[PDB]
Amino acid sequence: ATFEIVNRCSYTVWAAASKGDAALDAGGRQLNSGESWTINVEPGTNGGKIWARTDCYFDDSGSGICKTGDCGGLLRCKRFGRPPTTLAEFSLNQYGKDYIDISNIKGFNVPMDFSPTTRGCRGVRCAADIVGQCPAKLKAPGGGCNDACTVFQTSEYCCTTGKCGPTEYSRFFKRLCPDAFSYVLDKPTTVTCPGSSNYRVTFCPTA
């Protein structure tokens, strides 16, 4: 599958692509404003994620640090990033279908559109100014808007025992972005696409 990753933001981002135990393609790339990065994602990739990282720096060896989404201090991400991270999530060629979503479960840093570039399913978007409206407790000092599980680390917010429900924090994310997951047990907003679709992830999509 082809994924085009496009930075329309005014700021540089450092894009990242991983399936949790390995990079997808080169794993990461600096994208100045307006730049794009086209990657190949193998068919059958399950549990893949693409995200933006903000305000990073790296040395010539590719080691450094990002204020949002850092992935073990690497330019070329192997592993998932530190919240807050708006997440494009995908599992491909799963019994004939691809499954895509945007999630705010790990917070929000950069507005995002995640759409097919082939036919036959919708895209989804979370492009409201979540950072600017972020409630105080959720603001991340390094920038962005943390999810409540990261901040409070109890099942009320993390949904690890019992049956969590919405909170005033999850409801905030859901109000601003109805089409993205706001907590683990949110009503799903996953889209089923034809197997072997191609996609575009756009940071700061055009309104």
- The single-letter code of the amino acid at 68 is T
For residue 164, give both structure tokens: 């969590």
How far apart (Å, rounded) are the C-alpha atoms in residues 176 and 192? 23
Query: Cα separations (Å) of 87 from 137, 149, 180?
Result: 21, 15, 9
Which CATH fold would you assign to the domain 1-207?
Thaumatin (2.60.110)
* Buried/exposed 9-40: b ≥16 CB within 10 Å, e otherwise: beebbbbbbbbeeebbbebbbebeeeeebebe
For 68-128, give the secondary structure using H, E and C: ECCCCCECCCCCCCCCCCCEEEEEEEECCEEEEEEECCCCECCCEEEEECCCCCCCEEECC
In angstroms, rounded to a whole number, what is the distance separating the alpha carbons of residues 78 and 173? 28
In terms of Cα–Cα distance, which of 195, 187, 147 is closest to 45?
A: 195
Distance (Å, whole) CA 200 – CA 86: 15
CA pair distance 109, 157, nearest whole angstrom: 19
Tokens linked to 188: 């799903």
From the list 4, 205, 206, the residue with the least C-alpha distance to 110 is 205
Question: Residue 65's CB: how many other CB atoms inside 10 A?
Answer: 14
| Rounded CA separation 171/176 (Å) | 8
Burial string for 151-173 (b: 16+ CB within 10 Å, else e) reads: bbeeebbbbeeeebeebebbebb
SS3 59: coil
Q: For residues 13 and 11, give the distance between their C-alpha atoms in angstroms, rounded to a whole number.
A: 6
Number of neighbouring beta carbons within 10 Å of residue 186: 18
Contact 56, 28 (CB under 8 A): no
Give me the residue spans of the domains in the chain: 1-207
111, with CB counted inside 10 A (0-12, 13-18, 19+), is buried
Query: Using what technique was this structure determined?
Result: X-ray
Neighbours of 64 (CB within 10 A): 14
- Residue 84 to residue 75: CA distance in whole angstroms: 17
Experimental structure resolution, Å: 0.9
Q: Who contacts 187 (Cβ-Cβ below 8 Å, separation ≥6)?
A: none
Q: How far apart are the first and last CA of the chain?
A: 26
User: Are the C-beta atoms of 50 and 103 separated by less than 8 Å?
Assistant: no
